[PDB]
Ligand binder design. Structure first.
Ligand SMILES: *[C@@H]1O[C@H](CO)[C@@H](O[C@@H]2O[C@H](CO)[C@@H](O[C@@H]3O[C@H](CO)[C@@H](O)[C@H](O[C@H]4O[C@H](CO)[C@@H](O)[C@H](O)[C@@H]4O)[C@@H]3O)[C@H](O)[C@H]2NC(C)=O)[C@H](O)[C@H]1NC(C)=O
Ligand SMILES: *[C@@H]1O[C@H](CO)[C@@H](O[C@@H]2O[C@H](CO)[C@@H](O[C@@H]3O[C@H](CO)[C@@H](O)[C@H](O[C@H]4O[C@H](CO)[C@@H](O)[C@H](O)[C@@H]4O)[C@@H]3O)[C@H](O)[C@H]2NC(C)=O)[C@H](O)[C@H]1NC(C)=O
Ligand SMILES: *[C@@H]1O[C@H](CO)[C@@H](O[C@@H]2O[C@H](CO)[C@@H](O[C@@H]3O[C@H](CO[C@H]4O[C@H](CO)[C@@H](O)[C@H](O)[C@@H]4O)[C@@H](O)[C@H](O)[C@@H]3O)[C@H](O)[C@H]2NC(C)=O)[C@H](O)[C@H]1NC(C)=O
Ligand SMILES: *[C@@H]1O[C@H](CO)[C@@H](O[C@@H]2O[C@H](CO)[C@@H](O[C@@H]3O[C@H](CO)[C@@H](O)[C@H](O)[C@@H]3O)[C@H](O)[C@H]2NC(C)=O)[C@H](O)[C@H]1NC(C)=O
Ligand SMILES: *[C@@H]1O[C@H](CO)[C@@H](O[C@@H]2O[C@H](CO)[C@@H](O[C@@H]3O[C@H](CO)[C@@H](O)[C@H](O)[C@@H]3O)[C@H](O)[C@H]2NC(C)=O)[C@H](O)[C@H]1NC(C)=O
Ligand SMILES: *[C@@H]1O[C@H](CO)[C@@H](O)[C@H](O)[C@H]1NC(C)=O
Ligand SMILES: *[C@@H]1O[C@H](CO)[C@@H](O)[C@H](O)[C@H]1NC(C)=O
Ligand SMILES: *[C@@H]1O[C@H](CO)[C@@H](O)[C@H](O)[C@H]1NC(C)=O
Ligand SMILES: *[C@@H]1O[C@H](CO)[C@@H](O)[C@H](O)[C@H]1NC(C)=O
Length: 372
């Protein structure tokens, strides 16, 4: 006292990878030496009498304490400064949501903002839409501390399905006159779902014939989102493409199928739905049969009175036949009737009863032909 050594400015705040000027001086009349201790890269530089100046550029260092030294009178004169690099949130990220999140299942939300500083100036917010869920001021984290993460565990709500969630970070440079700088991570929309036991209730008649169209329905309730769930219904390889009704959490699929001409109904009826990563499938055994329509013929179909006529009917040998009350004799093949034409037999029609049993189910076909 005297002398002294001064560095200007003593405190400095700059952009990361940014630059500034430093003027370090002393009152020493004939400095025997002078210079600056720092690790930072220098672009330009200046100097003069009793004062030396440096432009330091590309500063990625969160905290650096450079020191200007002047050697005078075989003695060292040191002045230490402080350099801090602030960070704008050019990078704000948020973790992938569950592709489907079961409603009622706790899931977690993490917001990672790599390279954020100073940590003590940061207030982070995890929020659903306009409403803040969790807010964290990091003030009091060490001056050298950089980076910020916020995790919040959350219960899944049904009314919160389809909303937009985000992580908003707020940096306060207001004390330094630089002011607030805030940013928002890419908003993520959540997909949720719900299910239930009691596999789908499918209703169908168990008997089927080709060339005939019969309706079949499959339903279930307590399913959300109803609209976002897709359902499949088919007979064997053949798809029914049913009419799908959706009311609230319940659905209705109605169609009218047609038998496929092949074997079965040892085939099956498959009703399944896929929502989220889950599926509930119920199956139904059934029966498709082939029952050839019985043919009724007469020769001559129109005859004079008294002329002998013949009449026959056949089920294809696999079914039993009743011809005008007369059973097939013998059963394995068609029966017959013959007579002399009668005046009272004009406009007389005859019945042919074909009976085929499958799974105990008795099937009949009434077919008649009038005589002229
Ligand atoms: C869904 O997520 C939530 C959020 O993490 C969470 O629910 C919690 O489940 C746990 C275990 O089921 C419970 O947590 C605690 O349970 C004890 C009883 O053993 C309570 O006494 C606790 O109350 C105090 O908790 C703090 C102490 O750690 C106190 O500081 C505070 O003042 C409370 O008085 C606490 O509830 C509980 O069932 C809930 N907790 C809450 C508050 O919701 C869990 O991860 C998921 N819930 C499920 C799966 O049911
Ligand atoms: C309803 O839910 C059911 C869940 O089981 C689901 O079943 C699937 O049906 C399809 C046909 O519709 C299956 O078909 C596959 O077809 C291809 C040929 O194109 C095969 O390569 C597949 O191979 C499997 O089976 C082979 C033997 O045939 C094996 O060698 C092989 O290793 C495989 O196991 C298979 O035959 C399909 O496998 C099933 N299952 C699944 C998990 O998809 C049905 O699709 C659902 N309906 C809808 C629209 O959601
Ligand atoms: C250190 O890195 C520097 C970059 O950070 C490089 O800068 C060299 O020098 C100048 C200044 O940076 C560059 O720009 C030139 O600017 C003048 C105009 O000068 C303006 O400012 C003066 C006050 O100084 C003012 O009086 C004038 O009215 C202007 O408004 C232009 O006319 C030039 O064409 C030029 O663009 C140079 O480009 C750059 N040098 C080279 C070779 O590119 C430099 O590499 C390092 N050194 C210094 C001293 O900065
Ligand atoms: C950093 O070094 C000092 C800051 O302390 C600055 O020195 C300045 O130099 C000018 C030169 O014209 C001074 O102007 C005159 O100096 C004479 C003495 O040489 C004096 O008699 C005059 O009255 C007048 O002041 C100026 O005073 C001086 N500034 C200060 C604050 O002392 C220099 O400009 C700075 N350089 C850089 C690159 O920052
Ligand atoms: C949260 O933000 C999203 C947008 O980021 C809002 O939902 C969006 O609604 C629009 C308009 O219906 C959807 O647009 C399109 O729908 C057609 C179907 O007609 C589809 O083909 C397009 O590909 C597109 O999806 C859009 O899907 C939907 N956005 C998302 C992310 O699903 C929503 O309204 C906002 N929620 C709140 C609470 O404000
Ligand atoms: C906000 O985030 C976007 C996307 O990462 C980024 O490009 C942008 O620089 C940020 N804006 C501000 C001013 O923080
Ligand atoms: C459906 O098919 C299976 C063959 O795996 C059979 O065991 C079962 O008895 C059938 N169901 C009915 C109701 O007949
Ligand atoms: C019907 O035809 C048969 C066959 O020739 C004949 O024997 C019989 O007399 C005929 N019956 C009558 C009542 O015409
Ligand atoms: C004859 O036709 C009627 C009307 O379609 C039907 O209800 C009945 O089952 C048939 N008779 C027999 C024995 O198949």
């Amino acid at each position: 006292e005297p002398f002294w050594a001064d560095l200007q400015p003593r405190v400095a705040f700059v952009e990361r990878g940014g630059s500034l000027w430093l003027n370090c001086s002393t009152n020493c009349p004939r400095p025997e030496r002078g210079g600056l201790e720092t690790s930072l890269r220098r672009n330009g530089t200046q100097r003069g009498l009793r004062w030396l100046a440096r432009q330091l550029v590309d500063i990625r260092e969160p905290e650096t304490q450079p020191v200007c030294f002047f050697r005078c009178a075989r003695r060292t004169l040191q002045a230490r400064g402080l350099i801090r690099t602030f960070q704008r949130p050019d990078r704000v990220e948020l973790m992938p949501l569950p592709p489907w999140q079961p409603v009622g299942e706790n899931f977690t939300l993490s917001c990672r903002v790599p390279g954020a500083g100073p940590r003590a100036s940061l207030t982070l917010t995890l929020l659903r839409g306009a409403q803040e869920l969790i807010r964290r001021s990091f003030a009091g984290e060490p001056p050298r501390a950089r980076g910020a993460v916020l995790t919040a565990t959350v219960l899944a709500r049904r009314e919160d399905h389809g909303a937009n969630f985000s992580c908003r970070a707020e940096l306060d440079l207001r004390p330094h006159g630089l002011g607030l700088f805030e940013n928002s991570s890419a908003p993520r929309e959540l997909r949720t779902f719900s299910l239930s036991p009691d596999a789908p209730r499918l209703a169908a008649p168990r008997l089927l014939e080709v060339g005939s169209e019969r309706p079949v329905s499959c339903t279930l309730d307590g399913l959300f989102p109803a609209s976002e769930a897709r359902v499949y219904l088919a007979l064997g390889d053949q798809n029914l493409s049913p009419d799908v009704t959706l009311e609230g959490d319940a659905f209705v699929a109605t169609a009218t199928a047609t038998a496929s001409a092949e074997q079965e109904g040892a085939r099956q009826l498959v009703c399944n739905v896929t929502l989220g990563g889950e599926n509930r499938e119920t199956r139904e055994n059934v029966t498709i049969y082939s029952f050839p329509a019985p043919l009724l013929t007469l020769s001559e179909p129109s005859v004079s009175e008294g002329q002998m006529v013949t009449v026959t009917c056949a089920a294809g040998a696999q079914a039993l036949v009743t011809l005008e009350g007369v059973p097939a004799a013998v059963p394995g093949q068609p029966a017959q009737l013959q007579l002399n034409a009668t005046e009272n037999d004009d406009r007389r029609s005859f019945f042919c009863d074909a009976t085929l049993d499958v799974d105990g189910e008795t099937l009949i076909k009434n077919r008649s032909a009038e005589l002229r």
